[model samples]
Target: AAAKKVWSARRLLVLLFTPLALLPVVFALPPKEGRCLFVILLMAVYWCTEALPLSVTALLPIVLFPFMGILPSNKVCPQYFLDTNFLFLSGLIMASAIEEWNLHRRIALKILMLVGVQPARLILGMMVTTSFLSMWLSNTASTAMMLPIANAILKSLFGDEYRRNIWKGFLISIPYSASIGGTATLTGTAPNLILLGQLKSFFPQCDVVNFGSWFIFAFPLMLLFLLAGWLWISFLYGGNAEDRARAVIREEYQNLGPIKFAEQAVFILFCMFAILLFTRDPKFIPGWASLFNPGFLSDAVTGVAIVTILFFFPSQRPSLKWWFDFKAPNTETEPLLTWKKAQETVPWNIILLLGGGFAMAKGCEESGLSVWIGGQLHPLENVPPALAVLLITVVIAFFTEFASNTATIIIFLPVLAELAIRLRVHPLYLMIPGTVGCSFAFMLPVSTPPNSIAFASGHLLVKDMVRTGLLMNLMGVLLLSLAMNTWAQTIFQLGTF
Candidate 1:
């Protein structure tokens, strides 16, 4: 107890004094820029160590920016909730509805059953199922949902000997696939949204990055990484084929019985939501938005529209007698989603964290700090863009292994945006790779929530994660570099800014 008390005291001291110690450096620059830099540094320390809750640290911009006069409270407050944040919120609401109906579980189990029960094939199935689910659902949610099922299969296959090396592969594959899958879609993870919000904030007229465009660019990379991850894990820990696991997976799927009306409703609404997002501004044909005014809709609108329907959509099939009798339907037949369910499921702290990052990016722009940082990075102008991207990807991937991926991107992205301008390269050339790299944090349990969840299962040791994750990280960087230099270049037109 005494030792723990001392550790707590030391953490508190570091939290309080680190900013104070940096005051000298803050004053070394001009007052406005200096103050903004100070806030960034303070937030960086807090975010890295998490002396405060991650969300609480995010609120620092709202409090500090206004008082410091970099941006007013009114202006700063709005950064907490932008169109990008709404887009994120809409994704969460839809995910909540899916979870409310057990739709994700059914989808996962069905995929597992289809893949059969060979040891390598089961790992492949788990990865494929997790990756597909995570492309829409949050990575943590998908991993959390998949882990227990993987455990059940492990129990069935190995029973008391489930602690063997082969079982580690099965357990580890869930988080690895979840993290990779999240990189596929725009709303799959927070870093993607941070990239979007920062892009819009820094360059309002740049409309190149959106849901459809992002999916087109990132989905291929996701598939490639998913394959690499699955192959590596399977080779390392795949024992001989095990037919017993198929029955376990099938039994689990059977336990769900037939799909419920609520599951079908959620699934159908989810399909509609995805279709609208993809076709809304597909750029080949005139999008549905073209039917209305040019600015009448965005991806957020489609998500919100689906969620609204979810709230009103009936959980149970409505009875015709009630309709004809003109009597109100029983309240027991609740909507597909309830307000309380959404409220509980949504990660409200992430919303704040997004807002804080936006606020900081805005502050960097307003205070000329981004430009100052750009000036420091001016020498990189002579470096080839492809090499520069590789370097940035490597660094961001390494840094994110130890910090919050969102926080890592939040701090580096604005600086990268500024550097892009300074180097006369397209911002997306630097920013996109950096954003993707943030999701490549596979090295440690603390790297990402999915990793933490996998570790907590007690089936994986740190060495197990480290040995596998080192290769996974390298694979991510290599594949990402290849994609960026080739297809991503053509898709984004990375010839010039």
Candidate 2:
């Protein structure tokens, strides 16, 4: 009861401050600049406090920006929809198709089975599979999907003498891996897409950053993060003994039985789509993009092209004839995907939120607000670049733990981009670290969906997550800083502004 009231009371407290935020305008340098700053503060307070849905707060620019004279309605409204928005939409469509077919579940089961019956191997397999799935699907969805499988394993292992905390290790592994896995691919997490979207929105001529290039730069760090995360959790929670863990895995693997045709079809289509996304204008090798005209295809175009084929691909179930019901012919059954199902599962709230972020970025740049803010940050230029990088990365990483990472990115990216210009440094030197730091929100349940889900499993206190999460958060800051200075320099061309 006390816990319940705390959240409600906190919400009321934040709500009271919404209008008060606008008063900062009285002390500002310029009318337009002050208004933009006020809007930013209002949104930031609400976003951080959960006074409103993040998406709802995001949609504010649609009405508020125009009234404040920061931007016109037509101009503001269009920012919510862009080619980058479409790319996000198309990727979610493909993810929806995969989930609708239960392909994700089958893939998780198969990987867990293949790793055999050892406890350490089970943890590794679960984390690896969860992380892999998360790279393509939403981390929350990925963790949710994998939870049932983890619960099944837990139930089987709990036959009689199995201790609960020992198995909390298994439960916590799902969200950790899901969060870590998302770092690997552009479509893997919202922040990755945000990074790419902001780049295009701001630096239109800087065409070098794309899905293929981003993968090259980020995939190595993702590998290290996974391994380190797995080791950290296992050492802390998973005991060396495997008596019950092995039995549970063996039972679950045996129950999976024979592979179905639906699984095969979904797997093939997903592979085809992934290969297409990655092979386009791939670095270090010529790609399919070279054969087309200089400005021909884009990542969104390729995504839509591949996803459309799912509409006709057959599922496992079939009617009989294809004339009226169009059930089955010689080979095709039901279409592997359906439009209605895709619509229901595509996460439109996030889609709207992404659009809002894009809109905000456009407004920040158009209003010259980003440049002015950047100019104000000029004093930080006197600090050594390495120290500045560490400070900025740590601050952003910690701030994100209490706020939505997506909102954090939308709020900070414009300012960071301008700050880079002011500092006479490459935009990416700070922007990439800032974007990645948002995903490193590991210390609290509210930090991310995965952490919240893991905590909900009923075996952990907040302190358990805090202790391990704090370590992982420190590791995130250290590794991110080291990567920026070392191999990341070579892959991203980060030596100059």
Candidate 3:
């Protein structure tokens, strides 16, 4: 029998970093800042290694910060919950509603039907639907939800033809689409919320980056990235188009049957959420909120309001009672959500994970640790800002391949914020691109949950992924660099505060 394994290489690496916190008086930091560094070091090691649950690692600060006197317990406790935290909570609820009603599946089928069952068109529809859904839901959840339908389509078309590159590409597209779609909305991915929450906590004077503004900036980029990715996958994996593939897709659509009232209600709710998000603040353009008062509405409040409505919004009601009591009355009136169900669906771990990042940002600001890190990056002033942005984007895009992207963003944002000050530029110039780059990890299965899910389908090999992913990773870095420096500059006025 094999000897029981006690110390894996991952655990060993974690143990090696344990001393960093215990080492005497390093970082030459202030007493508070020094304590903060200890917590930071411990978190970095734990978060990177999965030595503890990611959410559990996030809870460390709530305990460490106050106990070490870096921040008072009262102050630290609130970091675990905030308006932005609730915003994330509400967004998850909205997505939960969509999933509970099978609205997401119905929407996917409808889009596929519209795009026709041709091979390229079917792939495009799949990509577009996955990407769009990801914009409002967790990338992991989005990919998971799409996988069954994808599998069904493949099974129907190819039966046992698992050797086909095109079949592999179809499976691969789900995860990639989920990642790319997440970049299009602030609520779409964890990293986006990290950037928004940190920016607000660190630099309150900056104008609010409402949902509309983020969509306007990010949606176009999402489209371009999706198109480029689809074309690449098609070129690599596609072969001759088959009539069988088209028939299978059409059958899937037909099987969904006519759209139900539940789908319609969810669709309306989804549309309402978008309209509110997009009109929250249109920047130079007129905004709906202006009618009440320009500052009357905030994205968080809007999100929660929409989610609150879902709690009471019934999905089904008794059809008009037989006029003369000719039939026994029906007893069903289905609310769109129930507290029990919502509790089950909410991504409490992710909410906690984000709160941890907020706490870290707050602690860094109060301890002056962020400033110290910025001072360290000050030497980068020797390079052009655009060049600096490119290098940083490339570095972040690749680094996230081996690290937790959420943890990576949490660790890097403060340093970049401080560096922005040192470089005499708005933090968004460096920070936004870097934050976006976190989602651009496409090189390995370990790079993101979506990639791993796709790979686990057994249709793809590491060699295939690496060969294609290396190029996709490079494309992500290059495209992000260009977008941020050009279109992003004009939109966000990146060089200016």
Whole-model lDDT values for every prediction: 0.77, 0.72, 0.73
Question: How do the residues 1-497 of candidate 3 rate in per-residue lDDT, one tens digit apiece?
Answer: 23345444566656565755456544466677777877776765665556776678778888888788778878877977866567557766776777788766665555555665556777888899899878866676577567756765555545535247777788888888898998888768778877887888888887647577788888878888888899988888774365665676677768778878777887788788767765665445766777786555666787789888888877874455545577766565678888899898665776666677668767767777766766767789889888788888887787676444665677678888778887788788887887888887676655666675576578877677677777777888888877876677777776466
Highest TM-score among the candidates is held by which one?
1
Q: Is candidate 2 or candidate 3 better by TM-score?
A: 2
Return the top candidate by lDDT: 1
Give me the runs in candidate 3 sitting further than 4 Å from their true place: 1-31, 114-123, 130-224, 231-241, 248-252, 291-296, 317-327, 330-332, 384-386, 394-421, 424-432, 438-473, 483-497
**Residue pairs that clash (backbone atoms under 3 angstroms), model 1:** none
Give the candidates in order of lDDT, highest first.
Answer: 1, 3, 2
The 10-residue segment of model 1 with minimum total lDDT is 154-163
Off by over 4 Å in 1: 1-10, 117-120, 130-179, 182-220, 231-245, 323-332, 381-386, 398-432, 438-474, 484-497
lDDT of 2: 0.72
Clashing pairs in 3: none
Clash number for every model? Answer: 0, 2, 0
**Every candidate's CA RMSD:** 5.1, 5.4, 5.4
lDDT measured at residue 292 in model 2 versus the true structure, 0 to 100: 90
TM-score of each prediction: 0.76, 0.74, 0.73
